[PDB]
Design a protein around this ligand. Sequence first.
Ligand SMILES: O=C(O)CSc1nccc2ccccc12
Ligand SMILES: *[C@@H]1O[C@H](CO)[C@@H](O)[C@H](O)[C@H]1NC(C)=O
Length: 347
Amino acid sequence: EDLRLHLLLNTSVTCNDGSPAGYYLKESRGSRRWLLFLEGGWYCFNRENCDSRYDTMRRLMSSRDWPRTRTGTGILSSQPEENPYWWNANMVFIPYCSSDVWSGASSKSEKNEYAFMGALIIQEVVRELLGRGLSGAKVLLLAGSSAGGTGVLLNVDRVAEQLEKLGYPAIQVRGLADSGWFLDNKQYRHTCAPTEAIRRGIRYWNGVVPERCRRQFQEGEEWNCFFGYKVYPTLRSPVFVVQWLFDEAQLTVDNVHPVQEGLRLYIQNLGRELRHTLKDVPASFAPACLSHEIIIRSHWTDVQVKGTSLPRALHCWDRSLHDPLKGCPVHLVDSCPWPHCNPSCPT
Ligand SMILES: O=C(O)CSc1nccc2ccccc12
Ligand SMILES: *[C@@H]1O[C@H](CO)[C@@H](O)[C@H](O)[C@H]1NC(C)=O
């Protein structure tokens, strides 16, 4: 059940402090399915708050203290009872140590105290995994939670193009974005809010975004591509979107903590706004819960939207991509308007 750590052989691809990045691997011979999960954990957009993050969240900025193994949980689990969806797949857990929402491509030098290479970590991991079985893969599912979910949206197309120009058009690259579908909305009450943090982060990380999204918003406005409802329509790879309607990180950046009318309308409008952004997303799972992340939580099989679980919804999504399905829905968005109106929400 354990995934074994492999630091990157290309030591030029580093975490924030210059230590090498890496990945955790549990191989599954006899399986051409490969799951590459992107860890979340917020971000940092200037020297000062990155220094604070280095004091108290150093494992998200450095590999010096990483454990040698890690137990696969939820969709990374290998037992069918915990992971009905992809229990037999090759499991990859990519630690989040770049603090850049998996967007940076900047090395640390005399002018940069930290390296932000999240976009290069994903590519270098994919490159070093071909020699360990990925070259024979049939499906590469790029998954991620929180900032890792947004990292899927930023990197799923880049993963497909890298394998294309490397002589592997048979590997079908897909994305699974969990809790990374954020809104650049107005805060309930008025450090940089959210939309200004990404604006400064891109310049601080020299972050990169999907090409077609970059061409729409152009120079100075690439921060728009960090938000799912604006970057998703420009992606070519199939992406399944998992999003709590009332995400805790979304409420945090909205300064939402007996609910009076003003806050009630704000919460119900947020749930409404998120539903609207998913109306055109065919493969989606959006329960009306106040929570954060799901796909690597051990009890991720418990939540249901309209009677269908997330593992089943992901199974139906696989079927839909096998070249319209009866009793196998892929678009599952709660309609009720308040946190925990879905009885299967976590407690
Ligand atoms: O990683 C985590 O737990 C939270 S990440 C996060 N939160 C809120 C808004 C964001 C916007 C853009 C990108 C990431 C965002
Ligand atoms: C290591 O990674 C860097 C940055 O992505 C790249 O420029 C370099 O060519 C890589 N080296 C090898 C041997 O792959």
